[PDB]
Design a protein around this ligand. Structure first.
Ligand SMILES: Nc1nc2c(ncn2[C@@H]2O[C@H](COP(=O)(O)O)[C@@H](O)[C@H]2O)c(=O)[nH]1
Ligand SMILES: [Mg+2]
Ligand SMILES: [Mg+2]
Ligand SMILES: [Mg+2]
Ligand SMILES: [Mg+2]
Ligand SMILES: [Mg+2]
Ligand SMILES: [Mg+2]
Ligand SMILES: [Mg+2]
Ligand SMILES: [Mg+2]
Ligand SMILES: [Mg+2]
Ligand SMILES: [Mg+2]
Ligand SMILES: [Mg+2]
Ligand SMILES: [Mg+2]
Ligand SMILES: [Mg+2]
Ligand SMILES: [Mg+2]
Ligand SMILES: [Mg+2]
Ligand SMILES: [Mg+2]
Ligand SMILES: [Mg+2]
Ligand SMILES: [Mg+2]
Ligand SMILES: [Mg+2]
Ligand SMILES: [Mg+2]
Ligand SMILES: [Mg+2]
Ligand SMILES: [Mg+2]
Ligand SMILES: [Mg+2]
Ligand SMILES: [Mg+2]
Ligand SMILES: [Mg+2]
Ligand SMILES: [Mg+2]
Ligand SMILES: [Mg+2]
Ligand SMILES: [Mg+2]
Lengths: 110, 100, 354, 95, 118, 31, 52
RNA sequence: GCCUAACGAGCCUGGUGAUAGCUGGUUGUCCGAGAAAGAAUUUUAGUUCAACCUUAAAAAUACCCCAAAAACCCUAAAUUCCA
RNA sequence: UCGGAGUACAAAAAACCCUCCGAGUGAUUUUAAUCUAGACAAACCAGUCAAAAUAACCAUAACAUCACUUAUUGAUCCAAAAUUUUGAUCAACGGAACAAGUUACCCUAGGGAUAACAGCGCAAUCCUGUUCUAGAGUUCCUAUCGACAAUAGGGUUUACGACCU
RNA sequence: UUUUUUUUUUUUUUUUUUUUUUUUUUUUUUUUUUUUUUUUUUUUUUUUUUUUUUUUUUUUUUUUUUUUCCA
């Protein structure tokens, strides 16, 4: 045989948290090799394209328009080459916060 | 070259009748590996209409497609996922047109 | 397995074949405009607004206010076109535009804005600040008439009260002056309501100055139901909202249940509900003026709490929820040495029997 | 592991465990991360911090270390200015 | 790969002649199911075994009464090839507390309230 | 997802056909 | 092209050295790094050669 | 080759109850529950973990799981998450 | 030894002495810190992210970047370092600090878990018949043959399997 | 740290008859430079022990190229 080195364990690249799951801050929502799910509100983006919740709440998945950063040359060129009626759509993952920021409690009645 | 059942191999035309073309194409059909026939537009239409008529006037209420779709008797354990589309007419590379 | 879409697809209108004959936009600005225009449409799939609170989408707002002024549209357009032609006829303005040296009469712009399109901006600002959500809970009005509220900080210092401005209790200690154009044939009522500051009832609001039966613009001559009271926000929970509401009324309204005493230093008596008030006086009163402003705690609130209200000053604090920690495990695996510190009751060494 | 010694007949212990491990009185075992002194220039700052940070051992490793170590090392030690005296005990363990 | 079998909704759409053939009421559906396990769960998938366990049909040829709700109808559809299902009939109505010890279940699918009077 | 009704909402490669990563080759074949 | 590993010390007087990969055919390395001992942006020059 | 009937290195005793991942055997009754393999290894004739399983003890959610959700050129049987 | 694609079509994993790409590093400056919630993955060892808070620069970013960016790398112990680091195709790449051939003069414990002879499965190979006619046969497919092709049968040779010893 | 080539007129190549082109100086050519034609000087980095000559081998430093440790 001439083929060698093909053997390699999988990287477990997939979606960790499904819609409706109550997650906390820092929980990795999903891991991916390429950009399949894009972060939305309260979802960060690690340097390895991982998605982690910044707030504690409920995970949701939506289909939303895609407006690329103007500095991304390939994305800008694709946008300019798109026809007049075309609008890019991407699957975004969001976290809807549940706990409020805080409460006002009486500390001293002086 | 892979060939499935129901696929034409050689298509002929001209100002001739059907008897002679069938006569000199039956030998080629026989020499072909898979079973084959020398058909025409009229013959293909006739056989398809006969198949539809048989499948619509079949007397027994139990049919392979109905049983496979309804998972009657738990027959999906014995059957194959492709059987849901084949409807019992195709088994391996062999096709039986008389099995509804 | 494939499923049928529940409605029209976004990019199913344009033809895939013959892209070269189809016009494209080459501007990122054009693409951004198109994307933002499409993002506001009610798509049949799960969108961002539905999950992040678009405020129940459409809402049939009940309108309680004066009818809009009836203006001849054709004559107004003709006059505006004539004015624009006269302005463009000048050469000096064009020279100034070319030389980039031009100024604008901001005072006249403000006056014209208040006259024609100020009410709508004030209404949307009040909607953003949630005035109608807490005053009527189902109705938003158009502040047709202007309302200029001003506090006097001295002899030559005047602090205006615009829609959403920040005025401290030091400037708000004295009763402000209210100005509005009105003929000598109508009756008006002015009500200063503090939406935030009630210690007991979250759904109730305080009244600082309620004066009814105003003949025309003469606010002083009208009888005051509730004497003016300086704002008293809490030290911790700051930035309360104080709103002046001006209502136009037809009949001479007399009420004995809502009458307040001259001292009026009891918070139990200074408990108000604008919804119930407008239910009581809905036949005659119609809101036409609104001016809301923000107010935070300062050193002047202590004097109001002590001398006037005869109360101890309440102090609040914005406390945050405690950090979340998972259930402590018997044998944590690959955890740092500080894992035990996350569940420590206190940073004090505890000796059980020694 | 010598279950029965030749001289005294007691049970000995392996010195490697005491050299490269630390046992808390709560039953937990403390160890260093493997490879925290090898090729530091080739590793990222976060990886180096992970290597330098201490770690704990799971139930199987803890039981193995307890079997391989005698009862002397499981005693309660009150050292002077002991950094781990705070971590010796366990609190709020709801099991 | 052999997995669970999806059953299309077309199968459970009754024909007008089905009511007359099976003696069912075209207007008002029955209220309770009498289910009896006919075949064994051996040589059958573990999910079917679990469904038959949670349906309380461990003992074969022993009728069990269940609701006519879709929640249990889903499992009954899953394991429909191993059970016989009949509608519960009440010619004498629901038995009261004074007739609980004198009830009986005839094989035709009806529940008699007064059984063996003296 | 493939089974979801919203499948292919991000399909965009059919809207643009400029995917020629060649150095300088020209067609010059329009008869 | 062969690389060279160089140990560079701080010029702030405090003892603080770090290793860096460099090209062999280049001059003496002199960069601006961060010193946590003085917590400042300091000039670091090549001092020693450790690995080829 | 021969060295007392077996010599690629004699025989006896002692070490010696040599050591064997290898073969063979392992002695009364009844009852309960009850396992076919993922990772390393001079390792695939074995060991050490993980997943299952057994005796006890704590608790509370456990399997089936409707919607809704999981990618971008086409893609079946169906999968994961939850009322 | 490590990574990518299909096998493995849609959460994850998933093997073969299965079919193909590679990797055991280069170039540049933005020389890329401390501490700590909460998570992925995993038998373990390892590998991955990362909110807030601090030190220096805009007083608005710092994940070093690019080469399909995913792989470009190594656990104790030990040596040399001197305060803080470095490390040999352990390449059999979870790795003994350093050890080659032959035994038909061989021995021992086992294995039909594993070969050679036999038996058995299949029929690649082999042997049979029939179907098809282009062509040979002076004209004429079938007196005698009959290429390119089809179907069915037998288990004599070799090969394959490793089921009984 | 170890292995190896080594140190040439002012600059580079050889070789032991220490030579050949650049550079310098003194002349000529030109109105003056440049180009070109003659003459001259110009060295084995240093120590030590030698051969028939030294390109025999050793002391102090100078750049140097490769290696600089599986664990
Ligand atoms: N690995 C494994 N072996 C089993 C299991 N059950 C039976 N065996 C093995 O099967 C043999 C006995 O066959 P049985 O009596 O089960 O038919 C024995 O070699 C026994 O060890 C099991 O669940 N797992
Ligand atoms: Mg692979
Ligand atoms: Mg693998
Ligand atoms: Mg108009
Ligand atoms: Mg003898
Ligand atoms: Mg023995
Ligand atoms: Mg073995
Ligand atoms: Mg039993
Ligand atoms: Mg068994
Ligand atoms: Mg569902
Ligand atoms: Mg559930
Ligand atoms: Mg996990
Ligand atoms: Mg931060
Ligand atoms: Mg090995
Ligand atoms: Mg290995
Ligand atoms: Mg490994
Ligand atoms: Mg011989
Ligand atoms: Mg033998
Ligand atoms: Mg065998
Ligand atoms: Mg075997
Ligand atoms: Mg024989
Ligand atoms: Mg054989
Ligand atoms: Mg035999
Ligand atoms: Mg064979
Ligand atoms: Mg055969
Ligand atoms: Mg012929
Ligand atoms: Mg044929
Ligand atoms: Mg034979
Ligand atoms: Mg043979």
């Amino acid at each position: 045989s001439k083929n060698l080195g093909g053997k390699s364990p999988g990287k477990r690249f997939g979606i960790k948290k499904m819609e409706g799951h109550y997650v906390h801050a820092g929980n990795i929502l999903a891991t991916q090799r390429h950009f399949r799910w894009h972060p939305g509100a309260h979802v960060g983006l690690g340097k390895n394209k991982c998605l982690y919740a910044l707030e504690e709440g409920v995970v949701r998945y939506t289909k939303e328009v895609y407006v690329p950063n103007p500095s991304n040359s390939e994305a800008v060129d694709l946008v300019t080459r798109l026809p007049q009626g075309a609008v890019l759509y991407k699957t975004f993952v969001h976290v809807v916060p549940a706990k409020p920021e805080g409460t006002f409690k009486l500390v001293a009645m002086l | 070259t892979p060939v499935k059942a129901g696929r034409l191999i050689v298509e002929m035309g001209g100002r001739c009748e059907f008897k002679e073309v069938q006569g000199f194409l039956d030998l080629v059909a026989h020499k072909l590996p898979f079973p084959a026939k020398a058909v025409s537009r009229e013959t293909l239409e006739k056989m398809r209409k006969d198949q539809e008529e048989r499948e619509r006037n079949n007397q027994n209420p139990w049919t392979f497609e109905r049983i496979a779709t309804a998972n009657m008797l738990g027959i999906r354990k014995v059957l194959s996922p492709y059987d849901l589309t084949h409807k019992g007419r195709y088994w391996g590379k062999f096709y039986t047109p008389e099995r509804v | 397995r494939r499923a049928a879409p529940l409605g029209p697809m976004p990019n199913e209108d344009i033809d895939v074949s013959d892209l070269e004959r189809l016009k494209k936009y080459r501007s990122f600005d054009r693409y951004r405009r198109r994307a933002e225009q499409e993002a506001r449409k009610p798509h049949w799939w799960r969108t961002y607004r539905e999950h992040f609170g678009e405020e129940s989408g459409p809402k049939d707002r009940v309108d309680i206010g004066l009818p809009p002024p009836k203006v001849s549209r054709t004559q107004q357009l003709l006059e505006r076109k004539q004015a624009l032609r006269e302005l463009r006829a000048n050469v000096e303005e064009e020279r100034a535009a070319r030389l980039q040296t031009a100024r604008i009469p901001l005072e006249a712009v403000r006056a014209e804005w208040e006259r024609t399109c100020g009410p709508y901006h004030k209404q949307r600002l009040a909607e953003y600040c949630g005035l109608y959500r807490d005053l009527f809970h189902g109705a938003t009005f158009v502040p047709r008439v202007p309302l200029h509220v001003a506090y006097a900080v001295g002899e030559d210092d005047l602090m205006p009260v615009y829609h959403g401005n920040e005025v401290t209790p030091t400037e708000a200690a004295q009763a402000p002056e209210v100005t509005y154009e009105a003929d000598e044939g109508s009756l008006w009522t002015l009500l200063l309501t503090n939406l935030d500051g009630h210690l007991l009832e979250p759904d109730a609001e305080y009244v600082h100055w309620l004066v009814t039966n105003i003949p025309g613009n003469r606010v002083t001559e009208g009888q005051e139901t509730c004497p003016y009271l300086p704002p008293f926000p809490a030290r911790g929970s700051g930035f309360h909202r104080f709103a002046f509401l001006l209502f136009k009324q037809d009949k001479r309204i007399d009420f004995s249940g809502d009458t307040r005493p001259s001292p009026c230093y009891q918070l139990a008596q200074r408990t108000f509900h604008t919804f119930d008030f407008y239910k009581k006086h809905q036949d005659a009163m119609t809101p036409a003026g609104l001016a809301f402003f923000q107010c935070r705690w300062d050193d002047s609130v202590t004097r109001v709490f002590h001398q006037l209200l005869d109360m101890r000053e309440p102090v609040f604090e914005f406390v945050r929820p405690p950090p979340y920690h998972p259930k402590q495990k018997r044998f944590p695996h690959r955890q740092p040495l500080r894992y035990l510190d996350r569940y420590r009751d206190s940073h004090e060494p505890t000796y059980g029997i020694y | 592991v010598t279950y029965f010694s030749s001289r005294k007949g007691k049970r000995k212990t392996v010195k490697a465990v005491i050299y490269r491990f630390l046992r808390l009185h709560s039953g937990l075992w403390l160890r260093r991360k493997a490879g925290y002194k090898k090729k530091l220039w080739k590793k990222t700052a976060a990886r180096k911090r992970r290597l330098r940070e201490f770690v704990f051992c799971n139930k199987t490793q803890s039981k193995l270390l307890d079997k391989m170590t005698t009862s002397f090392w499981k005693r309660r030690n009150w050292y002077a200015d002991d950094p781990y005296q705070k971590y010796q005990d366990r609190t709020n363990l709801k099991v | 790969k052999f997995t669970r079998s999806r059953i299309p909704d077309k199968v459970f759409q009754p024909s007008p002649e089905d009511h007359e053939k099976y003696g069912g009421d075209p207007q008002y559906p029955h209220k309770l199911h009498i289910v009896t396990r006919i075949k064994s769960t051996k040589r059958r998938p573990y999910w079917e075994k679990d469904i038959i366990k949670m349906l309380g049909l461990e003992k074969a040829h022993t009728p069990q009464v269940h609701k006519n709700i879709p929640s249990v109808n889903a499992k009954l559809k899953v394991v429909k090839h191993l059970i016989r299902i009949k509608p519960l009939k009440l010619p004498q109505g629901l038995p009261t507390e004074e007739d609980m010890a004198n009830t009986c279940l005839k094989s035709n699918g009806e529940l008699v309230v007064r059984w063996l009077l003296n | 997802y493939r089974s979801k009704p919203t499948h292919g909402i991000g399909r965009y490669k059919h809207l643009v056909k400029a995917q020629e990563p060649k150095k300088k080759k020209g067609k010059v074949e329009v008869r | 092209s062969k690389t060279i590993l160089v140990k560079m010390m701080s010029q702030a007087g405090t003892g603080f050295s770090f290793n860096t990969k460099r090209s062999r055919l280049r001059e003496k390395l002199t960069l601006l790094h961060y010193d946590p001992v003085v917590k400042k942006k300091v000039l670091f020059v090549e001092q020693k050669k450790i690995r080829s």
